[PDB]
């Protein structure tokens, strides 16, 4: 995942998401896709964890960002379906809204 | 155990308010005091126009 | 819609009240702890790809679409997500990876910094650097003039002259090697010229000995080795040579009339050859100069292309990694009116009257004119013979200056855009225009007739020097004093488009803020490496 | 009003309430 | 569209120097009701053009005139 | 009628700093950095940097 | 990212001037006669060029630093070998420090604007047009009735 | 309510220098409207005014055109 | 340009075949290293067989 060199190492010294924003969508209200897309992608509000920043990298945590166009299912239409990618567990919006 | 910082930038929600910058309430508390200061100066409080 | 750049600058800065800044120059002014704050969502919204400067644009029709233009070099990564310490440390990685050898010291960089911060720079040096047009034989005829000039500037003021133009640097390096100029004065020019050779060596060592097809990979990894990058001043014809050596499509917009082929050379260029090779048409070129509609002259009166062994690289290195870091980008394009400066010479008494002996000083017998004040504020005593030889460069001298918008394609691995309009990169080249250090008001009062300020680049568009050269932008940076930032200064729309540019604000803030030293030169060279996959390959290999 | 809506926008306008 | 202000250039050089050459070339100036200032800067431009021509044609003669071999026995 | 200290810009803290500070670059920088205002947007520009 | 163009020698010689009991009052009457005018300074250039060259080559100290316009004019003029080599550099450094501090304060205020004006009058109190310099020679008084 | 003390200023200037070109212009004052000790200081002020007038007028004609053409032609 | 009648360039050894020296001395190796700029390394210059 491409990430700038100013991403603090204190983000990486504890279990977090590999993108910037923490995906606390399980805490939000069930069967509400419209508001709960916002806590994953709308960067006008800060993190679930670190409320003094919006994302530790904007190049993967945004809705059309570089890490999102690589690993989401909306833009992997020409990919080989048999191979396995770890970041499909973190970037795929269909299974992120499953939780 | 996350290491959240507290910048000056987080304290701008209260340091930028017109209640922290108005002197109206502290002067309302001082002018209504039952025992003010006894040593008054009148050295350079006001400009006199020559 | 015209050639003349004075009215191009003037119709932009006449009554300029709204001074809007680019979004790539807005983020550039933030640190990384503030850029990721959720209050700057209007700047974090379009930072979502490390290579592309996405902007929304404007609702021209009903609904507007976003446009993504490439950030070519890694210097165009913003100061939030790539700070100046990070590029300054990548420079020290680059200095040991490629085994760079610094020939200059802090003394040479100090004496180059003390000229662009000097307001006592003689404007006579600009008129000799303008009357020579990067020509060799024009410099041969003015060897006693410039050997007086650099010695009188080095003994009196301690600084070295002509360091704004690379052409005068290399002409001093090869011609003035005798005891004419002083020893340490020549040593400084030798260090300045040798560091460009050393940086070209290091860039060739980083590029390696790998070839793609028949051509090298050095144009795919760096931008200084790219032949489709032009230096900001083109004194001779480097445009038709660019049309020959390009596999991509250069589209040189010479006054709203493009040309993209070499068979259309004399329709768009007029070669100004040697002096003896123009002697059969001196009067014809002078009648085209005095009697002629120059306003709409879509023809460049350029010199001939000499082909020095280094292809185009030492020009680009001097103008992009040496001068924007030794001077902290305190330069602006100095467009010269050439018939007004040779009206100043060849006049005023002893330049026209031959009754004076040729080796007599001009200042004790010079009438009260604009040449006498041009030498009064500078305190140099030239003979009348060198001023007669300097006025003699008028028949083969071009009429005006003009800027031209070279619009070359991107690299073959940077052409992945949907639209074909943002598959290109633009570069405004100042044909026959100078670049200038800081003017005083005593200099501007006596050279308002000769030069005019042209803000046309990121390193050559400083308003801390253009306000000392153009009186109409001095009121711009009185009204809006935040425009004095080199990253955020408004440049003319016909003359500088930020999004379509090689060097954006990200590199303009590294230029304008770094301390001038060896680590800054190595950091500026190492931030000219492209964000191309061949640069990733040639950086993983080192 | 420009100053008021610049200040109010450049700063922002179970989470433990944390005053100064 | 427009241009810069003109330099100072006070006086007329051809009047104060009559014993100088290149005034026979400077006599024929095609004035077809040119105004009292436009012909002045036309005189300026043509005079500095003739002066620059004379200085170049004497510079190339001083360049081609080297210390010769027949000037060595002389 | 010439200087009323309460109704001024530079007061006795400024003169008390300038009369004691040793003249060097850190004193020039401190005197430049103590002329910043106490506006809300004087704190905005100090929270950013 | 401030860059000091002034070293310790310039400050240590300005403090040498200010702690001089034997400072010439003729340098006060010359600045009194000129009083910050550009037309009057060029009349007295062969006077002040002898003044600050006998004060420099006599004591090692530099004159006229008690008033701003009298060294702004020495920054503009007098660099044409009127002053000595190492004495013009001190005036040039003193004038360059003010431009460096102006650039630093402009970078402190930023590139953001409120309404239509900048925030330089709002962040600092030196970029404020309302504060005036304590010594007036020209008219700075009609100006702040138009811009403030 | 008051002004500064007077400078030293020994004697009268005109008593030693009668060959002055400003001396007929200086004599346009009178004594019969004021005491003598302040008329002397009015003479001081008027003679300084005419003196600096003469030193200005000898200056302003020079530095406009002090390098002349015909002084270097002939 | 002056010394064209006196001397010429011989790309001779490994230490003595530097194409930054030959390209200022021979007019053909300069046009050679125009098209192939990576030959300017001392290790990779094409010396005559």
Using a threshold of 3 CB pairs under 8 A, tell whether chains C and F touch: yes
Q: With an 8 Å Cβ cutoff, are C36 and A56 in contact? A: yes
* C-beta of residue F49 within 8 angstroms of C-beta of residue G108: yes
Count Cα atoms within 13 angstroms, Cβ side, for A65.
29
Strands C424-431, C402-409: pairing kind: antiparallel
Chains in contact with A, counting 3 or more C-beta pairs less than 8 Å apart as contact: B, C
Of C335, C333, C336, residue with least CA distance to C460: C333
Taking the C-alpha atoms of residue C114 and residue C116, their distance in angstroms, rounded to an integer, is 6
In chain D, residues with a C-beta closer than 8 Å to the C-beta of B12 are 10-12
Deposited experimental method:
cryo-EM
Which ranges of C416-468 would DSSP assign to H, the alpha helix? 441-446, 463-466
Distance CA C537, CA E29 (A): 69
Residue C170 neighbours by CB distance under 10 Å: 21
DSSP C334: E
CA distance C367 to C347: 10
> What are the tokens at A58?
């904007």
**CA C539 to mean position of chain CA atoms:** 29
End-to-end CA distance of chain I: 27
* CA pair distance B2, A47, nearest whole angstrom: 12
Q: Is E6 helix (H, G, I), strand (E, B) or coil?
A: coil
Angle formed at CA C286 by CA C285 and CA C292, multiple of 5 degrees: 85
Q: Are C390 and C134 in contact (CB under 8 A)?
A: no
Q: Which two tokens stand for residue C106?
A: 């802090």
Q: By 3-state DSSP, what share of chain E in percent is helix, strand and coil, each rounded to 5?
A: 45, 0, 55
The structure tokens listed for G42 are 């060029």
C-alpha torsion A75→A81→A87→A89, nearest 10: 100
CA C77 to CA C52: how far, in whole Å? Answer: 9
Token pair 């800027």 in the structure block, residue: C403
Contact G124, G105 (CB under 8 A): yes
For residue B9, the distance in angstroms to the closest alpha carbon of chain F comes to 5
Strands C300-302 and C67-70: unpaired
Beta bridge mates, C270: C301
Q: Can you tell me the distance from the alpha carbon of C456 to that of C326, in angstroms, rounded to the nearest whole number?
A: 19
Exposed e or buried b for every residue in C148-169, given b needs 16+ CB within 10 A? Answer: bbbbbbbebbebbbbbbbbbbb
CA distance G34 to G131: 24
CA B20/CA B24 separation, integer angstroms: 10
How many H-runs (helices) and E-runs (strands) does chain A carry? 5, 0
User: Is there a contact between C435 and C165 (Cβ–Cβ < 8 Å)?
Assistant: yes
- Cα(C394)–Cα(C342) distance, integer angstroms: 7
Q: What is the largest CA-CA distance in chain H?
A: 62
Q: Rounded distance, CA H27 to CA H36, Å? A: 15
Touching E (3+ Cβ pairs <8 A), the chains are: C, H
Contacts of G75 (CB under 8 A, 6+ apart): C119, C440, G91, G92, G95
The kind and range of the H/E element at C7 are helix C5-10
Which candidate, C84, C30, C40, D19, places its Cα nearest to that of A52?
C40
Which residues in chain C have their CB less than 8 angstroms from residue E56's CB? 275, 392, 395
**What is the spatial distance between Cα C154 and Cα C146, in angstroms, rounded to a whole number?**
12
Starting at the edge strand found earlier in the chain, the sheet holding C332-336 runs C434-436, C332-336, C451-454
Q: Which helix H or strand E contains C333, and what residues bound it? A: strand C332-336
C424-431 and C233-234 beta bridge pairing: parallel
Q: Which two three-digit tokens encode residue C450?
A: 């000769």
Cα–Cα distance measured from residue G80 to residue C443, given in angstroms and rounded to the nearest whole number: 12
Q: Which residue of B has its CA nearest to C35?
A: B9
For residues E47 and E55, give the distance between their C-alpha atoms in angstroms, rounded to a whole number. 12
Mutate: best of C32, C36, C85, partner A, most A CBs <10 A:
C36
User: What are the phi and psi torsion angles at C481 (to 5°)?
Assistant: -80, -10
- Residues A55 and A41: their CA atoms lie apart, in Å, by 10
Say if strands G117-118 and C424-431 run parallel, antiparallel, or are unpaired: unpaired
Cβ neighbours around C54 below 10 Å, total = 18
With a CB cutoff of 8 Å and minimum separation 6, the contacts of E68 are none
| Residue of G95, G99, G126, G123 lying closest to G109 (CA atoms) | G123
Contact (CB, 8 A) for C175 and C140: yes
Residues of A in contact with C50 (CB under 8 A): 2, 4, 59, 66
Separation in Å, CA of D2 to nearest CA in chain G: 5
Number of neighbours of residue E1 by Cβ within 10 angstroms: 13
- Per DSSP, the three-state class of G8 is helix
CB-based contacts of H22, cutoff 8 Å, min separation 6: H47, H50, H51, H53, H54
> Which of G1, H18, G97 shows the shortest CA–CA distance to C513?
G1
Please compute, for residue C435, the number of CA atoms within 13 A of its CA located in the half-sphere on the CB side: 33
Determine the distance from the C-alpha atom of residue F22 to the mean position of all C-alpha atoms in its chain, rounded to a whole number.
16
Residue of chain I minimizing CA distance to C311 = I34
- Long-range CB pairs of D7-15 (<8 Å, 24+ gap) are D7/B16, D7/F40, D7/F41, D7/F44, D9/C39, D10/B12, D10/C39, D10/F41, D10/F44, D10/G112, D11/B12, D11/B13, D11/B16, D11/C39, D11/F44, D12/B12, D12/B13, D12/C38, D12/C39, D15/A51
| Burial of G108: CB neighbours in 10 Å, binned 0-12, 13-18, 19+ | buried
Could you give the CA distance from residue C363 to residue C480 in angstroms, rounded to a whole number? 42
Number of neighbours of residue H37 by Cβ within 10 angstroms: 7
The tally of CA atoms less than 13 A away on the side-chain side of residue C407 is 21
User: Resolution to 1 decimal, in Å?
Assistant: 3.8
Tokens of H21: 């070109």
Selected residue of E40, E42, E55, E64 to mutate for chain C interface (largest C Cβ count, 10 A): E55
Rounded to the nearest 10 degrees, how much is the dihedral formed by the CA atoms of C471, C477, C478, C479?
Answer: 120
Q: I37 vs chain C: nearest CA distance in angstroms?
A: 7
Token pair, residue C324, equals 């924007």
Instruction: Output the CA–CA distances (angstroms, integers) from residue G2 to C142, C332, E70, G97, in the order listed.
Output: 41, 22, 68, 10
Query: Given an 8 Å threshold on Cβ–Cβ distance, is C29 in contact with G111?
Result: yes
| Chain H touched by E37 (CB under 8 Å) | no
Tokens of F19: 């009369």
What's the CA gap between H62 and H55, in Å, rounded? Answer: 11
Place of tokens 């003044």: G51
- Mention every residue, 6+ apart, whose C-beta is less than 8 A from residue A88: A71, A73, A95
First-to-final CA distance of chain H: 62
Strand partners, F36: G124
Nearest CB neighbour to G125, from listed F9, F23, F24: F9
Tell me which chain B residues have a C-beta less than 8 angstroms from the C-beta of A14. Answer: 1-2
Beta partners for residue C529, in sequence order: C222
Give the rounded distance of the alpha carbon of C411 from its chain centre.
Answer: 23
Please check whether residue D6 is in contact with residue B7, taking contact to mean a CB–CB distance below 8 angstroms: no
C461 φ/ψ angles, rounded to the nearest 5 degrees:
-140, 30
Kindly report the backbone phi and psi dihedral angles of residue D17, in degrees, each rounded to the nearest multiple of 5, phi listed first: -65, 130
How far is residue G8's CA from residue G73's CA, in Å, rounded to a whole number? Answer: 23
Tokens of C204: 């060739």
Q: How many CB atoms lie within 10 A of CB C206?
A: 23
How many alpha carbons lie under 13 Å from residue E35 in its C-beta half-sphere? 2
**Chains E and B make contact, 3+ CB pairs within 8 Å:** no
Those residues with Cβ within 8 angstroms of residue A19's Cβ, 6 or more apart along the chain or in another chain:
A1, A55, A57, A60, A61, A67, A90, A91
The two three-digit tokens of residue C44, written as one number? 């974090």
What φ, ψ does residue C258 adopt, rounded to 5°?
A: -75, 165
Among residues C197, C195, C177, which one has the least CA distance to residue C186? C177
Query: Helix crossing, C84-97 with C183-207: angle to 10°?
Result: 90
Task: For residue C39, give how far its alpha carbon lies from the nearest alpha carbon of chain A (Å).
Answer: 7
Please answer whether residues C374 and C447 qualify as being in contact, where contact means their C-beta atoms are separated by less than 8 angstroms: yes
Q: Are I12 and I22 in contact (CB under 8 A)?
A: no
3-state class (DSSP) for residue C73? strand
* Distances from the Cα of C295 to the Cα of E2, G34, G106, angstroms: 8, 46, 39
Cβ atoms of residues C385 and E59 within 8 Å: no
Record the tokens describing residue H46, joined without a space. Answer: 């008027």
Alpha-carbon distance of C371 to C366, in angstroms, equals: 8
Chain breaks in chain D (C to N over 2.5 A) after: 13
B contact residues 1-50, partner A, Cβ 8 Å cutoff: 1-7, 9-10
State whether F36 and G97 contact (CB < 8 Å).
no
Q: Which residue of A has its CA nearest to C87?
A: A5
C38 at D interface, C-beta within 8 A: yes
- Contact C457/C503 with Cβ under 8 angstroms? yes
CB C358 within 8 A of CB C386: no
Shortest CA distance to G89 belongs to which of G99, G80, G98, G79?
Answer: G79
d(CA F17, CA G22): 27
Residue C430, SS3 per DSSP: strand
Q: What is the CA radius of gyration of chain E?
A: 18
> What is the C-alpha to C-alpha distance for residues C467 and C475, in angstroms, rounded to an integer?
8
Q: Which residues of D touch G122 (CB under 8 A)?
A: 3
Q: Which two tokens stand for residue C56?
A: 């929304």
Query: CB neighbours of C292 closer than 8 A, spacing ≥ 6?
Result: C399
Question: Which residues face I31 on adjacent strands?
Answer: none
Q: How far apart are CA C199 and CA C192, in angstroms?
A: 11
Based on the number of CB atoms within 10 Å of its own CB, is D17 exposed (0-12), middle (13-18) or buried (19 or more)? exposed
């Amino acid at each position: 995942i491409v990430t700038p060199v100013t991403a603090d190492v204190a983000y990486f010294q504890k279990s977090n998401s590999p993108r910037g924003r923490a995906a606390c969508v399980v805490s939000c209200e069930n069967y509400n896709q419209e508001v709960a897309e916002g806590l994953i992608y709308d960067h006008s509000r800060p993190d679930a964890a670190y409320e003094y920043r919006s994302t530790v990298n904007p190049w993967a945590s945004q809705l059309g960002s570089l890490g999102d166009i690589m690993y989401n299912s909306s833009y992997r239409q020409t990919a080989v379906p048999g191979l396995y990618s770890p970041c499909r567990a973190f970037f795929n919006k269909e299974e992120l809204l499953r939780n | 155990n996350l290491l959240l910082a507290f910048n000056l930038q987080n304290a701008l929600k209260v340091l930028c308010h017109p209640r922290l910058h108005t002197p109206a309430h502290t002067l309302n508390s001082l002018n209504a005091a039952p025992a003010p200061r006894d040593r008054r100066e009148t050295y350079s409080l006001q400009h006199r126009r020559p | 819609n015209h050639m003349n750049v004075l009215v191009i600058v003037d119709e932009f800065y006449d009554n300029k009240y709204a001074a809007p800044v680019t979004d790539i120059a807005l983020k550039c002014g933030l640190p990384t702890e503030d850029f990721l704050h959720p209050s700057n969502y209007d700047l974090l919204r379009l930072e979502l790809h490390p290579l592309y400067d996405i902007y929304i644009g404007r609702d021209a029709g009903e609904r507007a679409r976003h446009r993504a233009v490439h950030r070519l070099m890694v210097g165009n990564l913003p100061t939030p997500l790539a700070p100046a310490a990070f590029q300054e440390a990548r420079g020290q990685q680059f200095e040991t990876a490629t085994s760079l050898a610094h020939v200059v010291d802090q003394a040479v960089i100090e004496t180059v910094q003390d000229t662009a911060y000097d307001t006592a720079y003689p404007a006579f040096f600009y008129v000799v650097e303008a009357m020579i047009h990067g020509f060799e034989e024009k410099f041969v005829m003015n060897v006693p003039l410039v050997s007086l000039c650099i010695n009188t500037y080095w003994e009196r003021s301690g600084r070295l002259a002509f360091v704004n133009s690379f052409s005068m640097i290399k002409f001093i390096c090869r011609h003035l090697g005798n005891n004419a100029i002083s020893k340490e004065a020549y040593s400084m020019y030798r260090k300045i010229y040798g560091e460009l050779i050393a940086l070209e060596q290091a860039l060739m060592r980083l590029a390696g000995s790998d070839v793609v097809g028949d051509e090298s990979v050095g144009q795919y990894v760096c931008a200084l080795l790219d032949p489709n990058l032009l230096p900001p001043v083109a004194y001779t014809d480097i445009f038709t040579h660019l049309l020959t050596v390009s596999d991509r499509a250069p589209q040189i917009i010479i006054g709203n009339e493009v040309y993209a082929d070499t068979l259309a050379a004399p329709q768009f260029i007029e070669r100004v050859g040697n002096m003896d090779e123009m002697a059969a048409q001196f009067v014809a070129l002078y009648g085209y100069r005095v009697n002629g509609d120059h306003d709409h002259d879509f023809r460049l009166h350029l010199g001939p292309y000499v082909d020095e062994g280094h292809a185009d690289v030492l020009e680009k290195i001097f103008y992009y990694v040496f001068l924007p870091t030794c001077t902290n980008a305190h330069m602006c394009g100095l467009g010269v009116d050439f018939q007004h400066v040779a009206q100043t010479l060849a006049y005023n008494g002893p330049a026209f009257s031959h009754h004076f002996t040729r080796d007599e000083d001009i200042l004790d017998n010079l009438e009260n004119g604009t040449l006498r004040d041009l030498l009064e504020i500078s305190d140099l005593r030239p003979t009348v013979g060198m001023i007669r030889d300097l006025s003699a460069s008028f028949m083969t001298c071009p009429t005006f200056t003009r800027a031209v918008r070279v619009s070359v394609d991107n690299d073959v691995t940077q052409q992945l855009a949907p639209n074909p309009a943002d598959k290109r990169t633009e570069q405004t080249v100042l044909v026959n225009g100078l670049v200038a250090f800081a003017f005083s008001e005593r200099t501007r009062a006596v050279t308002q007739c000769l030069f005019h300020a042209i803000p046309f680049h990121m390193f050559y568009g400083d308003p801390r020097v253009a306000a000392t050269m153009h009186q109409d932008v001095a009121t711009f940076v009185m009204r809006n004093p935040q425009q004095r930032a080199v990253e955020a200064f408004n440049r003319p729309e016909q003359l500088f488009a930020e999004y379509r540019e090689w060097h954006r604000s990200p590199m303009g803030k590294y230029a304008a803020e770094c301390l001038p030293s060896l680590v800054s030169i190595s950091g500026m060279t190492a931030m000219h490496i492209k964000m191309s996959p061949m640069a990733y390959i040639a950086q993983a290999k080192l | 009003q420009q100053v008021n809506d610049y200040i109010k926008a450049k700063v922002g306008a179970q989470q433990a309430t944390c005053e100064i | 569209a427009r241009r810069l202000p003109k330099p100072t250039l006070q006086g007329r050089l051809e009047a104060d120097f009559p014993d100088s050459p290149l005034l026979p070339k400077f006599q024929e100036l095609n004035q077809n009701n040119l105004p009292n200032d436009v012909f002045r800067e036309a005189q300026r431009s043509y005079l500095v053009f003739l002066t620059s021509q004379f200085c170049y044609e004497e510079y190339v003669q001083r360049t081609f005139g080297v210390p010769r071999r027949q000037r060595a026995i002389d």
